[PDB]
């Protein structure tokens, strides 16, 4: 028997079997309920649409995301998204196969309890475990030592790790995201005279963000140059075939990660949380963290972001000390690839929460074994 490895994030869901090299199912994670009065008769009206269907239908539907930041906002919806994942997309019943589930570094314990409860009680999962994403990114990228930086929709977080020991007191959380980047991209697109209000159109904005945004290696030079010409400027095609043309704004969307005052958040940019996380740690290991610094999850896919972090950390950190950044092309998936490795390992087989251990102690048990 071989065990499912499945990652809920806000945004995508990756699921597949342990020991695969790449996930078997990838689809956006959406629930959609129709908002128009169905006029045709015999249409086949359906109570709700889950994942990729809703993204096809989206013009008709209103799209809600059941996970925001890291926190699961309502539980019937995920019960759907898991039902759909196991039964149709993997076509393997959750009684048959152990399961490994994934979370942000800091979340309300109530959700991890509810998650284990639904897994044992509703799906009758034989056993399961919950594993912190930055650990999996390390397994994914061949290292026992590094600082991990991960960002999806929802959470951005850092975890330093040194020869396999976490340093809990240095864990940082921050809520800059693919999502809040999209919302700011919309609000700045308003300044250029284009506007996207409805939920489905937000996903058009998100496709703009994926295709066209990029990070300025140096910010004021490119802002001046983009005022000086349209050489930067590029244009893109809405689903009806209208054209839109976007400006100096193009780099400004990913930039807010580096200067969260652009969204009015208070925390310093990711430079200063990365550095302050390193400095929070003990002073020998810092030499090894600066050498091994690893990036994970989709919000770090922006072209240029690696070289911008090398520049600005090398400014911020003490000089004469090697600073290197590791940004593998896989990185959008590496949390899954690390889950595949971890679940395949033999040692891990002790470490499942087996159903009896839940039956004895209720959902409280998850805190004891898992983290």
């Amino acid at each position: 028997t071989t065990a499912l490895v499945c990652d809920n994030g806000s945004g995508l869901v990756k699921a597949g079997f342990a020991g695969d090299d790449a996930p078997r199912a990838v689809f956006p994670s959406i629930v959609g309920r129709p908002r128009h009065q169905g006029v045709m008769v015999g249409m086949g009206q359906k109570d709700s649409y889950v994942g990729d269907e809703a993204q096809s239908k989206r013009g008709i539907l209103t799209l809600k995301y059941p996970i925001e930041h890291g926190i699961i906002t309502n539980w019937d919806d995920m019960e759907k998204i898991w039902h759909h994942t196991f039964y149709n997309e993997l076509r393997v019943a959750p009684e048959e196969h152990p399961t490994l589930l994934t979370e942000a570094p800091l979340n309300p314990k109530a959700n991890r309890e509810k998650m284990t409860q639904i897994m044992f009680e509703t799906f009758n999962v034989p056993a399961m475990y919950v594993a912190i994403q930055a650990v999996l990114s390390l397994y994914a990228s061949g290292r026992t030592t590094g600082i991990v930086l991960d960002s999806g929709d929802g959470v951005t977080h850092n975890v330093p790790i040194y020869e396999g020991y976490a340093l809990p007191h240095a864990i940082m959380r921050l809520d800059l995201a693919g999502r809040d980047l999209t919302d700011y991209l919309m609000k700045i697109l308003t300044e250029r005279g284009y506007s996207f209000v409805t939920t489905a159109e937000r996903e058009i904005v998100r496709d703009i963000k994926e295709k066209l945004c990029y990070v300025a290696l140096d910010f004021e030079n490119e802002m001046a140059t983009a005022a000086s010409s349209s050489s930067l400027e590029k244009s893109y095609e809405l689903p009806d075939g209208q054209v839109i043309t976007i400006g100096n704004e193009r780099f400004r969307c990913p930039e807010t990660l580096f200067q969260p005052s652009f969204i009015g958040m208070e925390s310093a940019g990711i430079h200063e949380t990365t550095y302050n996380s390193i400095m929070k740690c003990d002073i020998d290991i810092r030499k090894d963290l600066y050498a091994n610094n690893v990036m994970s999850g989709g919000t770090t896919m922006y072209p240029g972001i690696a070289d911008r972090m090398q520049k600005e950390i090398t400014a911020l950190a003490p000089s004469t000390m090697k600073i290197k950044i590791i940004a593998p092309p896989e990185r959008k998936y590496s949390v899954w690839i690390g889950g595949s490795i971890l679940a395949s390992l033999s040692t891990f087989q002790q470490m499942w929460i087996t159903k009896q251990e839940y039956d004895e102690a209720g959902p409280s048990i998850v805190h004891r074994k898992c983290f």
Binding site: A25, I326, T347
Partner: protein
């Protein structure tokens, strides 16, 4: 007490492992008073409390079956074998169902056709042991009951497992009456130079060791004519293709090729000197003494021809092998830890690509990058230099192992024959326990395969004796059974040694000696049979069936990694230049399996095959390191008798009732000890009463229908009391006749 003056004992001697001694005065509870053959002066100390092994009486010594000896211990066995070999020139011997064989290097007449006929009807009890007696029993078993029968041979391959199998087939042929119909032995023996060329290597202790298990199924008709044969192979030691430790070589074929390289026949291949290539260089030992590799190559070709592999295919085979060699000389530069590149216009990759007809650009690209495919989107990713090296060596192993399976398929194509295989008898050639002063993953595999065969042997023996006791209407429950499942679970169970190796392969910055720490954490005191050597943290010791063996972590991960990047295969599979290379792959998860996992899977096939079948064993022994014909050396033979499990089998036999006598056979010999009132009209009840009076401990013997059994040593105790009482009677009568002579001399003076 068993010891007295004029008892005899073996003593430990370094000149040769055990030496005969005779006891001068009765022992009473710390020093023993002793004669050697020479000197005849000694003291020996019981050194708490030991006692020296006590020597069987000469009536037992020399008799055909080792179990018939009343004491069973290493000295007695080694002596009885030595006397049968030297004085009777009898090579074959028995230990229970096992047949032991010691090869001479002289040739013997005893396989002559007449003797075949003399065996052909008999049961093995009726005859001195000889290989035909096993072939005969297998034949009769297959006749009496419908089951198949298997014959299993073991021991370091210099011992002539080949000659034993050859004569087993000659017997099958001649008693079957298929000498006209069949060419089976002729083809089988024609095949051997191919297998010997692609399966054998020079190990640090022996030349022409064979690293694979070979199983040959002789098919019988419904009327028990020979149909033909089918060949299988198991347990091929792929790791040797890439890596060697000093004074080893890899498989002979590479050297037989390099020797011939100067011929026009191979001018295409641009072969060099045999140590030019990174796969053949590392052993430091290009040449085996006294083999001219070219002269072996010729015989290899002629055997291939005689098996109907054409001149077209043979040049394909050597083309591939040269490809593996040239592939070995590929070399990489690291540009950064995350990536590597091949130097421009790299010569050996150029030659390799032309040998395969796959373009330099294509494989220069795929050698240094691996491809992910997510469902939506592919990614193409650089790999570290170390991983590039791992991946190349993987590919070289995968190519070799497939070429081997291919040649064995064609040899089968020649052996195989149309008619329905009604039932079959199968003859199996496998190595025994391998232990050297340095032991490594290859030894670890060989010893685990032996631990499994030894288990299945132990269960078969226990079944036969649990049957015989119920045949004799004795309680079987008395018979104890000894189970090496606690070792096998240490090797192959989950979180065994193998599963922590296969885990440590994939864990990040997994490394040669931090594996060991996982071993020590898991087993060091929690398990029975696993031990750490005091001197070191790089090694561990397993209590195998026969002996302790230590292993060293120094090679384990680099030997154990195998992972093949799908597209590096895809490149070759596409090639158009010549036929064979697309033919090899012609048959998805296998590409991830480690060598230890493919070995465990190959071993389960072998065990599933043999468990279907009733075995009959053989053992082989190599009685001197130097090929002196009919010379026997105890320090070698003791080592091999330990390494073949023979000694530890006999030790298991010692536990209960090795020794058996039938009532009349016992009664005749012991009648000397019987008083007239004790003789009865009934033999059974007579011998019961005699034995109960002569031996007070009733736990030492058991009565059954025709056979009494004795725990080891009671028969010698009886022969002792028989000699003592007879000698006393003889001394009395002798002294009387000496007095009569004196009385006549006295009368002569008086007269």
């Amino acid at each position: 007490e068993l010891y007295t003056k004029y008892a005899r004992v073996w003593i430990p001697d370094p000149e040769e492992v055990w030496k005969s001694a005779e006891l001068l005065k009765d022992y009473k509870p710390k020093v023993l008073q002793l004669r050697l053959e020479e000197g005849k002066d000694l003291e020996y100390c019981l050194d708490p409390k030991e006692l020296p092994p006590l020597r069987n009486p000469d009536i037992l010594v020399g008799e055909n079956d080792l179990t018939a000896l009343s004491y069973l211990h290493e000295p007695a066995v080694l002596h009885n074998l030595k006397v049968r070999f030297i004085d009777s020139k009898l090579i074959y011997t028995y230990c229970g169902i096992v047949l032991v064989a010691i090869n001479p290097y002289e040739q013997l007449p005893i396989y002559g056709e007449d003797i075949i006929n003399a065996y052909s009807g008999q049961n093995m009890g009726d005859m001195d042991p000889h290989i035909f007696a096993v072939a005969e029993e297998a034949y009769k078993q297959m006749a009496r009951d419908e089951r198949n029968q298997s014959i299993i041979v073991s021991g370091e391959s210099g011992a002539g497992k080949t000659v034993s199998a050859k004569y087993a087939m000659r017997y099958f042929a001649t008693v079957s009456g298929s000498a006209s119909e069949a060419n089976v032995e002729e083809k089988v023996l024609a095949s051997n130079p191919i297998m010997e060329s692609i399966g054998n290597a020079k190990t640090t202790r022996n030349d022409n060791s064979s690293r694979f298990g070979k199983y040959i199924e002789i098919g019988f008709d419904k009327r028990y004519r020979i149909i033909g044969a089918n060949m299988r192979t198991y347990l091929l030691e792929k790791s040797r293709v890439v890596f060697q430790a000093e004074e080893e070589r890899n498989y002979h074929i590479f050297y037989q090729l390099c020797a011939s390289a100067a011929l026009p026949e191979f001018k295409t291949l641009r072969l060099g000197n045999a140590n030019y290539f990174h796969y053949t260089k590392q052993g430091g030992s290009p040449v085996i003494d006294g083999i001219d590799d070219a002269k072996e190559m010729v015989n290899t070709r002629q055997a291939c021809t005689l098996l109907g592999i054409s001149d077209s295919y043979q040049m394909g085979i050597f083309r591939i092998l040269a490809g593996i060699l040239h592939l070995g000389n590929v070399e990489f530069a690291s540009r950064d830890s995350d990536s590597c590149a091949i130097p421009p216009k790299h010569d050996p990759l150029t030659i390799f690509c032309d040998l395969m007809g796959v373009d330099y650009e294509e494989m220069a690209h795929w050698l240094c990058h691996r491809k992910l495919a997510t469902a939506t989107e592919t990614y193409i990713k650089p790999i570290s230099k170390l991983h590039a090296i791992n991946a190349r060596d993987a590919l070289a192993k995968h190519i070799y192992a497939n070429l081997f399976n291919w040649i064995v398929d064609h040899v089968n194509k020649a052996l195989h024959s149309t008619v329905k295989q009604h039932s079959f008898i199968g003859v199996l050639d496998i190595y025994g326990f391998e232990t050297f002063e340095i032991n490594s993953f290859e030894q670890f595999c060989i010893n685990y395969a032996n631990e499994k065969l030894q288990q299945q042997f132990n269960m078969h023996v226990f079944k036969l004796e649990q049957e015989e006791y119920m045949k004799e209407q004795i309680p079987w429950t008395l018979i104890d059974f000894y189970d090496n499942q606690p070792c096998i679970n240490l090797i192959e169970a989950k979180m065994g040694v193998l599963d922590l190796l296969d885990e440590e392969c994939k864990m990040p910055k997994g490394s040669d000696d931090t594996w060991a720490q996982k071993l020590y954490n898991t087993h060091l005191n929690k398990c029975a049979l696993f031990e750490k050597p005091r001197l070191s943290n790089k090694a561990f010791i397993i209590k195998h069936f026969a002996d302790k063996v230590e292993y060293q972590c120094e090679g384990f991960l680099e030997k154990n990694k195998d992972t093949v990047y799908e597209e590096q295969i895809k490149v070759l599979k596409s090639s158009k230049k010549f036929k064979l290379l697309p033919e090899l792959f012609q048959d998805s998860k296998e590409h991830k399996k480690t060598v230890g996992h493919q070995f465990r899977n190959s071993l389960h096939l072998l065990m599933e095959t043999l468990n279907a079948t009733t075995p009959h064993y053989v053992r082989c022994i190599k009685p001197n390191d130097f090929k002196f014909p009919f010379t026997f050396d105890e320090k070698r033979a003791v080592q091999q008798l330990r390494a073949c499990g023979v000694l530890e089998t006999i030790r298991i036999s010692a536990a209960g009732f090795p020794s058996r006598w039938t009532y009349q056979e016992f009664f005749s010999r012991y009648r000397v000890l019987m008083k007239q009132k004790d003789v009865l009209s009934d033999r059974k009840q007579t011998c019961k009463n005699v034995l109960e009076k002569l031996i007070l401990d009733k736990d030492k013997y058991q009565f059954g229908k025709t056979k009494i059994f004795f725990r080891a040593g009671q028969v010698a105790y009886l022969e002792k009391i028989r000699a003592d009482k007879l000698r006393a009677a003889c001394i009395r009568i002798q002294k009387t006749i000496r007095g009569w002579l004196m009385r006549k001399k006295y009368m002569r003076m008086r007269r």
